[PDB]
Every structure is written in structure tokens, then in C-alpha cells.
Curated annotation (Swiss-Prot), chains A, B:
UniProt effect for mutating residue 61 to R: Loss of interaction with FBXO4
Effect of mutating residue 15 to D: Abolishes dimerization and telomere binding
Protein name according to UniProt: Telomeric repeat-binding factor 1
Signal peptide: none
TRFH mediates dimerization: region residues: 1-204
Cross-link (Glycyl lysine isopeptide (Lys-Gly) (interchain with G-Cter in SUMO2)): 149
Length: 204, 204
């Protein structure tokens, strides 16, 4: 009975790990395809499964961080979202903190995604008329040539500036989608997806 | 691309079905062991996975109904819970409606669980001093000899009546646990649990 309950709890922990890996892969794919409602529903499922887990491997922690980063990016234009206990941190600033904390290579793509997040963290404030908040975001990020151009835009209140059209929200999203594409290749071999794919393939 | 996206969606639907079956089995077990917090957390996970599904087999629908019934039983003493759009229906009345709707055998255990739910649906109202609400519950359920005894208890306001001690909340719970024990034997062979058990067994 004591050994049996321990065996069941261990099996439930192995099953939860598989469900987490599956849901994290499904979330990345929904983000890549632009399936917004599927992303929202799958994020709810991932969060509930996490609250039912007590141990995470380093790989599962990295995976969770990537999903958290994608969640903040999707809500980048939702300034009413409070992702941190400090209520002044905007969603794109929260995504920037996680992007600089994930144990991943700092290749050219990493740095471009970082700089696109920094420019947009200011742009989304200006696009709503929150000019003082844009200055506060700027001071918290910067904490150049790139630095002084952005401060000049904030002071001039030039919301629809051509600089924000070159390094746009669409460009930031596309570069983040390219990264998600590499992640999706790595996780497409997780236990749950592989066994589900074999069942579908066997009925064709 | 069009065929590939269809294959992925089918595989995700097969994986979700496995996760639902696993979570429903885990919920029944937590209910049986009296692990209240695990029941609460696993119910949240089951609900989120259901909102991500669009097709359910008859077996999966029956399983969902059993979990819904267990959720109402656990909140039987929480009169502030509103499980139906009709705000007057108490949690035990909601459990009674589902128990009479599940496609299952109406054996001796089924009927005893039904009658224990009916007696307790009144008892939990009286135990809180809600004597008028107990009369309304009584009229919605009854809708005897059993019938006239209960009405006499409601009118006399005898909350701590010996009748409610013979057919008690503990007795209703134990009989429901015996039923859950039969369900647990049937579902202990689901795909996710079987493959998780084999991984744990292979490391001993
Ligand atoms: C997508 C990915 C992850 C989450 C999440 N919620 O809480 C947590 C815990 C912080 C340590 C794990 N992760 N929510 C959505
Ligand atoms: C445990 C079991 C099931 C549920 C649940 N929530 O919504 C539903 C839908 C009604 C048709 C399926 N089921 N919640 C907890
Ligand atoms: Ca705000
Ligand atoms: Ca009430």
C-alpha cells in the first residue's frame, strides 16, 4: 500500500512530464501558425499541468521559459497586462527579461530579436499616446546611436515614425517565428506526439 | 502543407484524448484517497484539456459525467457553489441530476447512492439553518414513508436528527468511494498510465 501509492505518484509525475512537453510543443506551433485562440486555450492547459508538477528537469524549465516568453510577446500590445509583481513592467519588458535569462546560444538571431523587442517596447507605448510611460520604459531598458534616436522620437512625440516601420512589430514577430521554427523541429519527437502520429499514420 | 496541418490536428486530438483519460483516472483516485488538493488541481487540468477538444466518444462523455458528479459531491457542503444556470439548484441536487443521466447499470449500489444523495441534499441545508431552502430542495426532489419522515424533520427544524446520522454524509461518501473503486479498476489500463507505469517499473 505504501509502496503502491509511491509507484502511482511516480507514474503520474512521468505522465505529467509527457503532457507538459506535448503542450509546450503545441503552444509553439500555434504561435508559429498565428492560431491565436488555440494558443490561448493551450496556454491555459499548460499552466494547469504545471501547477500539478513539483519537479522539473533543466530541459523542462527552459521549455517553460520559452512558453512564458511567447505568452508575453502575444500580449505585447496589451499594456493592461501585468506579468510581474512590479506593476510598471510592460509585457514586452517582461519578454526581454526572460529572453536574456533562457540558457540558449546568443547567436545573431538572438541579438536581433532582443533589439526588435527593445524598440517595440517603446513603440507600443507611443502608439497609445502614453509618452511619459515610453520614457520610463526607455530608462529601464537603455540604462549610443540607437539610444539617442529613440529618445529623440519620444521627446518629439513622433508616434508614427519611419524608424518604427523599419524595425516593426511584424518584423519582430517574423524573426520570433523563425526561432520557434527551430524549437518545433527539436520537440516534434516528444513521446506523446510521436505515439499520436503513429496512431494517425496507421489509419491512412 | 494542407494535408500536413490536418495530420497534426488529428495527432493533437489523439493526444488530448489520452490526456483526458489519464486526468479523469487521476481525479477518481484522488477522490478515493481523500487527497483534496490533488483533486482540486487535477480538476482544473481536466477542464482546460476539455476546452481544447471538439469530439468526444460515448466512453469519454460518460467519463466526463463521472468527473462532474465527483466535483459536485466534493462541494456538497458548499451551498455558495452554483453549478447550474438555475441559481437555486444546490451542489447535491446537481450531482443527483448527473447520477440519474449517466449510462450505467442501475444496480443496488446505484440506488443506495441516489437515496443517500437525496437525504443529504436536505441535511446540509438544515445543518446551516437554511430551513426554508431545505423545504424547496425537498419539493424539487420528492415530487411515501421516507418522504413524510424528511418533511417532519424539516417542519420540526430538528437539524441534528438521528435519521441524518444513520444515513450520514460519511456513509454517502464511503458508498461513492466503493463505486469509484470499480471505475478505477476499469481505467487503470489507459494508454498514458500504462506507459508511465512501464517506465517506473523499468527503473526498479
Ligand atoms: C505557459 C508556460 C508556463 C506557464 C507558467 N505558469 O506558471 C509557471 C511556473 C513558474 C515556474 C513554472 N509557468 N504559463 C504558461
Ligand atoms: C471535470 C470534468 C469535466 C469538466 C467539464 N467542464 O466542462 C465540461 C464540458 C461539458 C461538456 C464537457 N466538462 N470539468 C471538470
Ligand atoms: Ca499599463
Ligand atoms: Ca446558496
Amino acid at each position: 500500500e505504501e509502496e503502491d501509492a509511491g509507484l502511482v505518484a511516480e507514474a503520474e509525475a512521468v505522465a505529467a512530464g509527457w503532457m507538459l512537453d506535448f503542450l509546450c510543443l503545441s503552444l509553439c506551433r500555434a504561435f508559429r501558425d498565428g492560431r491565436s485562440e488555440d494558443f490561448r486555450r493551450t496556454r491555459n492547459s499548460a499552466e494547469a499541468i504545471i501547477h500539478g508538477l513539483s519537479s522539473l528537469t533543466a530541459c523542462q524549465l527552459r521549455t517553460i521559459y520559452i512558453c512564458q516568453f511567447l505568452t508575453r510577446i502575444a500580449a505585447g500590445k496589451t499594456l493592461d497586462a501585468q506579468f510581474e509583481n512590479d506593476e510598471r513592467i510592460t509585457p514586452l519588458e517582461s519578454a526581454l527579461m526572460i529572453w536574456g535569462s533562457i540558457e540558449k546560444e546568443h547567436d545573431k538571431l538572438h541579438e536581433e530579436i532582443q533589439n526588435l523587442i527593445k524598440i517595440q517596447a517603446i513603440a507600443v507605448c507611443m502608439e497609445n499616446g502614453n509618452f511619459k510611460e515610453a520614457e520610463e520604459v526607455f530608462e529601464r531598458i537603455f540604462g549610443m546611436p540607437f539610444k539617442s534616436k529613440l529618445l529623440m522620437i519620444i521627446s518629439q512625440k513622433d508616434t508614427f515614425h519611419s524608424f518604427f516601420q523599419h524595425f516593426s512589430y511584424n518584423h519582430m514577430m517574423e524573426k520570433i517565428k523563425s526561432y520557434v521554427n527551430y524549437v518545433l523541429s527539436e520537440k516534434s519527437s516528444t513521446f506523446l506526439m510521436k505515439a499520436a502520429a503513429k496512431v494517425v499514420e496507421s489509419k491512412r
